[PDB]
Every structure is written in C-alpha cells, then in structure tokens.
Amino acid sequence: DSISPAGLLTTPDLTGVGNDNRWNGQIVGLQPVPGGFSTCNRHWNLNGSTYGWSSPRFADIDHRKGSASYTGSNATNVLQFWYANAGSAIDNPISQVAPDGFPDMSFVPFNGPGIPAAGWVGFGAIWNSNSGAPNVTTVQAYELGFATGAPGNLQPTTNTSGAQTVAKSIYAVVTGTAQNPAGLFVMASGIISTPNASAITYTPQPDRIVTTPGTPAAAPVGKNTPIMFASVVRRTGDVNATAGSVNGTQYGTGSQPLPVTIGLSLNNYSSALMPGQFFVWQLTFASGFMEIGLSVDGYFYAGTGASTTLIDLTELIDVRPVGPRPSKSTLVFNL
Amino acid sequence: SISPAGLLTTPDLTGVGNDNRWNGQIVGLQPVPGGFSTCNRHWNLNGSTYGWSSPRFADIDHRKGSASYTGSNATNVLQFWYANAGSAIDNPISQVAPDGFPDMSFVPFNGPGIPAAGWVGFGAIWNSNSGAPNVTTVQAYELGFATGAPGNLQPTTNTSGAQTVAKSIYAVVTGTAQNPAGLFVMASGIISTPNASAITYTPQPDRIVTTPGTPAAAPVGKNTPIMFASVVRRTGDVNATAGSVNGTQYGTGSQPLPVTIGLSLNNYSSALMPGQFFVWQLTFASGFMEIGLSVDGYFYAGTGASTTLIDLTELIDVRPVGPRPSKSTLVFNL
C-alpha cells in the first residue's frame, strides 16, 4: 500500500540524461563532501517539501522591484548593479525569500577590471517596472548572489535572513541605468565565472551555499559522507572548454539529480523511509560497484569516509535499487 | 514489446513537462489543421531523430563562423555571425547545425525595430583560438536559418544549402569582424516581438526548418496534428506571463520533452503499427478528449478544422487507452 522510493533514481539519471539541480548540467560525477554541507534551493525532501525558493525547473529569474545603480558620473560602459532585499519576492508563490531560480550562492564582490572567481553568472537585463520593456543598453552577463551591505559595503552572506539578492554585470554594458524601482530578468541556467581560462575547483564549495532558516544540514554518519552531483559547466574564462579541456575541466555541483527533485515534489514519500534510514541504490561498473543512500532530508551519501576525490560516472553501467538500510551501516565502496 | 503507455503521463501536461523547442511549461495544445513538420529535438517510435539536437537544453556553440557588422563604426553596432549548414563538424548527432541551434527560418531586420517572431537567445562572439569570449559582444541574438549571408539575407526552411545565422537584436558595446570567430548562445530562447503585445503562436508551421528525410504530420480524417504550447517570454515585455494585459505569448513544440527523452531511450517500433495511433484519454474538470501518437512521433487531436488553442489549466489526468486505428476520430468533448 505504501509508495516505493526505488524509482526515484534510475540509470538515465546518472548516465547522461539526468541534470543537476543547481546548474542544469549533465551529471557525470559524484563529489564527496566529508565536511558536510547544506542545500535548500531546488532541493526537496521525502515529505514533499522544500526549504528553498525555487520550483524544480530552470526557466528565468525575475524581480520587478529592485534598485539599479552604477558607480560614477558617466553611464557609458559601466558595470550595471542591481539589488533587492531577500524577503521581497512577493510574486513567488513558493517563498518570498528570493525570485524563483535565484542562485543559492554567496556573492563574490568585484569592481573590475578582473572577473570574479566562482560566481554564478547568467545573461539578462534590467527592465522597466511599469511597462516590462527591457532596457536594451543593459544586456550583459551578470553575477548573481546573496550579500549584505549593498550598495556601498557589499559582503557575502550564506544566510537568507536579512540578506540582499544582488546582481552585477561582469563586463561593461552599453549604458548603465540608475532607477528604483527597476526590474531584473536573467535566464536561470548559469555559468561559472573564472578570472582566466583555467578551471577552478568544483563550484559552489560548501561555504558558499546560501540556505534559509531551518534548512537541515547533511552531516557524515560514520563512514558515510554526503555527496553532490557534478556536471561539466561552462565558464567565462574559456567558453569553449568542456570535459578534458587543456585549460582544465570545470565542475558545477548540485545536491540532487533534478529528476529526483521532481519525483520528490510530486508525491509524499514519508511512508517509504523512516528517519535514520537511507534508501540505497547500487551503481555498477565493470571493475566493481558502489552504493549510494538517500536520507529523508533528500541528501545523498556514499561510503567514502574522508575522501574528496571525484567519482567519474563515464563508465557507470546501471543503477539498481537495493533497499532501505540503517544510515549507520557503511555503504559499500568496491571500485 | 514495451508499451508506449508510460511515454505520456499526467505530470507531462499538468505542469512538469516542458516543450521540446522552447523548454517552456506546457499549458496548451495547439491544433494545426494544415499539418506541419518538425525534426529538431523530435524523436520517432523507432529511436530516430532527423534533426541535429540532443533531447536537452544546454548551449549552442560553433567555433568556426564569420563575425561581421555593417559599416566601419564598431561602436554600438548590431553584431552578425554566420556559418554554413553542414559545417557543425563537432556535433556528433549531425553536422547540419550546432546542437540546440533553433529550427526556425531567420527573420531579417536592420534595426532599430525588433523583428517579429524570431528565436532569441543570449550569448556572445568568442575567440576561436583561445576560447575567450569577446566581452563587448554580449547581447540578445536572433538565430535562424537563411541564405545570402552576410549582405542579402533570405529566410529558408530547407537545411540543404542553408546558413546558420545570428544577429544581435540590440546594439553591442563594440562589434567584431573576424573569421574564424565563435558563437556561444544559451539554448533556451525567448520570442522577439516588435513591442509589448503578444503575437501569434511561434513558430508558425511555415517557419519550421527541416532536413532531408523528415516526415510530415498530415491530418487523418478529422484527426489533426497538434503542437504543445507553453507561455514563453517575449522581448517586448519580459514580465508578461499567462493572462497579461498585453496578451499571452505562446511558443510551440512538437513534443513534450519527457516524451522525446523516452523515445530516445527505448525503441517502440513493435509497439505500434503504421496506421495506428497510441491513444490516451485526457480528463478535465469539465469534459475529456483523446490524444493520439503516431509512429513518426507526432501527436493528434480530433478537432478537425479548428485552430483554437486547448487550455490545459483544468486538465486532471492522463490515462492510456491503447493502439487504435488512426482513421477513427479521436473523441473531443470539451
């Protein structure tokens, strides 16, 4: 009579069809996080709910009532700034914390000419709050993230309470605009900012992830360690680079495969799994196999202990359900 | 044989499924009495696409096009780029065009007015040798298929002899003229409109670009091919959504992307014979209708000559019926 969780994760989700829930990139690796991490945005639990502010999809990021500004007395070829307060996203029915799709990363301040490291970047524009019309001189790539102190003392924050949702173009716009209210419109699939062509570490690192009050953390349980799902994500320093680039492979991480997030958002799985258990799947390769476990908070784990080495899924054969297990029982790692 | 029944389920048409052209949330079914064709990001029941795109929305990239702009003043110019169809040597699916390049004929424009019914995406020109984006060229670009580039652009819907072209709809900081030059554009597009008002559903059938071998969806008796409609952003009013005072803008695709993905992962060639549709029943708050899927991957409704969009807001459930003759009229009680 109870719903089964076994179909939440299936072979295509990790062999090329499944995309991650932060970057919408094709999942190709598992990144262990021995230090633990938290994530709420676009992350669902087994009770049908999210602590975040985003639906399980990638469309656009829009807010009608922020403050657009720029520095100096000449609007030509400036960096465009925009911000609103967290809690002001009144048109988002999920949560007013931030616009649906706004990235859960702390802002990396920059004034140029260098490009910030490890920023979430999306393409978009400022727009006219009354008419909807885009300000055509403001289209650019913008870093988006959470901060305090805008506009004058911008500092990263990872707590949504009292934060500001900020945007700043990483390159000059044709003509900046200074207007409050003004709208922001940015496409919801992002790229990673880098200072030059070289790839950087997997992005976001745990200490950049923004969460709302009450978001549960993923902590190690014995030798079981939480994992993120890694995809190869485009970067600003070399937009051609993909897997295997001579300039380095850039990984972006998410807490869940989006198909899992979607399944959790469609049905309540509370009956499927007791708190303190994991539901376990086996990932089989030619050389061996490994188990990953899903907790009631929606986080995945592997039996990798202190390791931070990315697990490559290029040679993954299939995913098979194993069943529910105590979270303390060590997940097999036989690669 | 594996059954087609699981290809189309309730979430695919009640909010989770996005269309295979715009990646928008499907909220309507648009009948096309005259029939239409689509190959890009469209799969059939024999595991085949005739298009050039994988069943996902990532980015559009080509390393070896020609960037240019009109005149000898690079400041605040409209940026142009093209390459030939057939030159997408790094796309394993097909070298016709880069993966994700939209299957729409280009709408020419000189500015400053914005073209009607163009596919628009955000991106930039980039350096073919280093990979570095040309940061003065970031903009919204209209992409589509044409001939005659760069100086005499003619829309085309035939990939044979075509060019894949891009032109910024608004001025860039500084244009570039280089060959080779790369194009990088994000794959989820928006619709260009001349002003705030919504236009007709986009693309209309006569704008859809196809390759050799692509089959057409023709009406079978009173059964008419449909597209799947989503509310897609438009350049003239980026805040408009469903119900806007400025009109609701629909973008259409030939399939729900969950269907495309299912057809790409398993072969359904024994599950259905030419001449048959696989039928599901769509139950609404008030009434119901049948939808049929043909072996060529096109969907149908029993709506005859009607052009009126079917609103899915009150759709409750999708339930499989099974294979039925395509000549039997699909029920429509809405």
For residue B250, give both structure tokens. 């629909």
Resolution value (Å, 1 decimal) = 1.4
Cβ contacts (< 8 Å) between A262 and chain B: which residues? 11, 16
> Are residues A294 and A236 part of one domain?
yes
Instruction: Classify residue B76 as exposed, middle or buried by CB count within 10 Å of its CB (0-12, 13-18, 19+).
Output: middle
Please choose, from the candidates A266, A60, A102, A17, the residue with its C-alpha nearest in 3D space to the C-alpha of residue B24: A60
Residue type, A101: G
Ranges of beta strands (E only) in chain A are 27-32, 37-38, 60-69, 81-85, 120-127, 140-148, 155-156, 164-169, 179-187, 191-192, 217-218, 225-232, 251-254, 277-284, 289-294, 300-302, 311-312, 318-326, 333-334
> Are residues B45 and B64 part of one domain?
no
In a domain, B243, yes or no: yes
> Are residues A172 and A116 part of one domain?
yes
- Report the DSSP beta bridge partners of residue A60: A187
> H-type helices in B29-172, by residue range?
none
CB atoms within 10 A of CB B243: 8
Instruction: Classify residue B1 as exposed, middle or buried by CB count within 10 Å of its CB (0-12, 13-18, 19+).
Output: exposed
Radius of gyration of chain B (CA): 20
CB atoms within 10 A of CB B11: 16
Nearest-angstrom CA–CA distance, A93 and A185: 18
Radius of gyration of chain A (CA): 20
Contacts of residue B86, defined as CB under 8 A and 6 or more positions apart, other chains included, come to: B95, B96, B159
Q: Select the residue of A131, A234, A241 nearest B196 (Cβ to Cβ).
A: A131
- Grouping H, G, I as helix, E, B as strand and the rest as coil, residue A253 is strand
Q: How many CA atoms lie within 13 A of A153 on its CB side?
A: 2
Contacts of residue A224, defined as CB under 8 A and 6 or more positions apart, other chains included, come to: A278, A293, A301, A302, A303, A327, A328, A330, A331
The torsion angles phi and psi of B181, rounded to 5 degrees, stand at: -145, 145
Nearest-angstrom CA–CA distance, A102 and B279: 39
Contacts of residue B126, defined as CB under 8 A and 6 or more positions apart, other chains included, come to: A239, A240, B132, B133, B134, B181, B182, B183, B184
Nearest-angstrom CA–CA distance, B165 and B146: 7
Q: How many CA atoms lie within 13 A of A220 on its CB side?
A: 15
Q: For residue A22, what is the DSSP state?
A: T
Cβ contacts (< 8 Å) between B24 and chain A: which residues? 59
For residue B180, give both structure tokens. 């080779």
Burial B154-172, CB ≥16 within 10 A → b, else e? ebbbebeebbbbbbbbbbb
Please choose, from the candidates A23, A1, A10, A17, the residue with its C-alpha nearest in 3D space to the C-alpha of residue A202: A23
Cβ contacts (< 8 Å) between A77 and chain B: which residues? 173
Quote the number of domains for chain A: 2
Q: Kindly state the greatest CA–CA separation across chain A.
A: 68
In a domain, B307, yes or no: yes
Residue type, B282: L
C-alpha distances (whole Å) from A292 to each of A35, A45, B69 are 17, 16, 53
Ranges of beta strands (E only) in B69-156 are 80-84, 119-126, 139-147, 154-155
CB A210 within 8 A of CB A218: no
Nearest-angstrom CA–CA distance, A203 and A195: 14
> Are residues B251 and B171 part of one domain?
no
Residue type, B265: L
In a domain, B194, yes or no: no
Best residue of A240, A245, A258, A318 to probe chain B, by most B CBs closer than 10 Å = A240
> Are residues B308 and B207 part of one domain?
yes
In a domain, B192, yes or no: no
> H-type helices in A162-279, by residue range?
258-266
Q: Can you give B295-312 as a three-state secondary structure string?
A: CCCCEEECCCCCCCCEEC
> Are residues B179 and B71 part of one domain?
yes
CB B126 within 8 A of CB B166: no
CB atoms within 10 A of CB A155: 11
Query: What is the interface size between A and B, counted as CB pairs within 8 Å?
Result: 117
Q: Select the residue of A132, A171, A239 nearest B126 (Cβ to Cβ).
A: A239
Element housing A14 (H / E): helix A12-15
Chain B CA closest to residue A239: B131
Residue with tokens 């009434």: B287
Report CA A32 to chain centroid distance, whole Å: 16
Q: Select the residue of A58, A134, A174 nearest B238 (Cβ to Cβ).
A: A134
Element housing B227 (H / E): strand B224-231
> Are residues A172 and A202 part of one domain?
no
In a domain, B195, yes or no: no
Indicate the residue among B187, B210, B225 that finishes a domain: B187
Please choose, from the candidates B17, B3, B46, the residue with its C-alpha nearest in 3D space to the C-alpha of residue B320: B3
Please choose, from the candidates A219, A246, A230, A221, the residue with its C-alpha nearest in 3D space to the C-alpha of residue A192: A230
For residue B125, give both structure tokens. 């020109």
Cβ contacts (< 8 Å) between B123 and chain A: which residues? 123
> Are residues B179 and B218 part of one domain?
no
Please choose, from the candidates A6, A121, A12, A30, the residue with its C-alpha nearest in 3D space to the C-alpha of residue A310: A30
Indicate the residue among A188, A218, A239 that finishes a domain: A188
Q: How many CA atoms lie within 13 A of B332 on its CB side?
A: 19
Contacts of residue A71, defined as CB under 8 A and 6 or more positions apart, other chains included, come to: A78, A79, A81, A111
- Grouping H, G, I as helix, E, B as strand and the rest as coil, residue B93 is coil
Indicate the residue among A167, A188, A209 that finishes a domain: A188
Q: Domain containing A107: what range?
A: 60-188
For residue A53, give both structure tokens. 């502010």
Strand B119-126 relative to strand B178-186, pairing: antiparallel
DSSP A282-304: EEE-SS-EEEEEE-TTS-EEES-
Q: For residue B234, what is the DSSP state?
A: B
CB B196 within 8 A of CB B244: no
Task: Look at the alpha carbons of A96, A99, A101, A107 in this order and tell me if their dihedral is positive or negative.
Answer: negative
Q: How are the residues of chain B apportioned to helix, strand and coil, as percentages rounded to the nearest 5?
A: 5, 35, 55
For residue A167, give both structure tokens. 């945007």
Chain A CA closest to residue B76: A174
Contacts of residue B200, defined as CB under 8 A and 6 or more positions apart, other chains included, come to: B117
> Are residues A200 and A138 part of one domain?
no
CB B175 within 8 A of CB B74: yes
Contacts of residue B289, defined as CB under 8 A and 6 or more positions apart, other chains included, come to: B281, B282, B301, B302, B310, B330, B331, B332, B333, B334
Q: For residue B230, what is the DSSP state?
A: E
Contacts of residue A201, defined as CB under 8 A and 6 or more positions apart, other chains included, come to: A118
Element housing A105 (H / E): none
Contacts of residue A261, defined as CB under 8 A and 6 or more positions apart, other chains included, come to: A21, A42, A43, A44, A56, A298
CB A126 within 8 A of CB A184: yes
Q: Can you give B265-333 as a three-state secondary structure string?
A: HCCCCCCCCCCEEEEEEEEECCCEEEEEECCCCCEEECCCCCCCCEECCCEEEEEEEEEEECCCCCCEE
> Are residues A328 and A201 part of one domain?
yes
- Report the DSSP beta bridge partners of residue B186: B59
Please choose, from the candidates A237, A240, A243, A157, the residue with its C-alpha nearest in 3D space to the C-alpha of residue A192: A237
Contacts of residue A147, defined as CB under 8 A and 6 or more positions apart, other chains included, come to: A83, A106, A107, A109, A154, A155, A156, A157, A163, A164, A166
Please choose, from the candidates A80, A81, A86, the residue with its C-alpha nearest in 3D space to the C-alpha of residue A102: A86
- Report the DSSP beta bridge partners of residue A167: A82, A144
Asked if B235 lies within 8 A of A134 by C-beta distance, the reply is: yes
Q: Smallest CA–CA separation between A167 and chain B, in Å?
A: 16
In a domain, A257, yes or no: yes
- Report the DSSP beta bridge partners of residue A38: A217
In a domain, A266, yes or no: yes
- Report the DSSP beta bridge partners of residue B36: B217
Query: CA-based angle B326:B331:B334, to the nearest 5?
Result: 145
> Are residues B68 and B44 part of one domain?
no
Residue with tokens 């179909």: A7
CATH number at residue A49: 2.40.510.10
Task: Look at the alpha carbons of B198, B201, B207, B211 in this order and tell me if their dihedral is positive or negative.
Answer: positive
CB atoms within 10 A of CB A87: 16
In a domain, A1, yes or no: no
> Are residues B320 and B281 part of one domain?
yes
CB A233 within 8 A of CB A181: no
CB B191 within 8 A of CB B203: no
Nearest-angstrom CA–CA distance, B143 and B146: 10
Please choose, from the candidates A122, A253, A114, the residue with its C-alpha nearest in 3D space to the C-alpha of residue A196: A114
Asked if A17 lies within 8 A of B261 by C-beta distance, the reply is: yes
Instruction: Classify residue A285 as exposed, middle or buried by CB count within 10 Å of its CB (0-12, 13-18, 19+).
Output: middle
Burial A27-49, CB ≥16 within 10 A → b, else e? bbbbbbbeeebbbbbbbbbbeee
Asked if A137 lies within 8 A of B172 by C-beta distance, the reply is: no
Task: Look at the alpha carbons of B101, B51, B127, B81 in this order and tell me if their dihedral is positive or negative.
Answer: negative
C-alpha distances (whole Å) from B320 to each of A158, B3, B323 are 47, 10, 9
Q: How was this structure determined?
A: X-ray
Best residue of B63, B239, B244, B263 to probe chain A, by most A CBs closer than 10 Å = B239
Nearest-angstrom CA–CA distance, B293 and B291: 7
Phi/psi region, residue A47 (left: phi>0; alpha: psi -120 to 50; beta: rest), is alpha
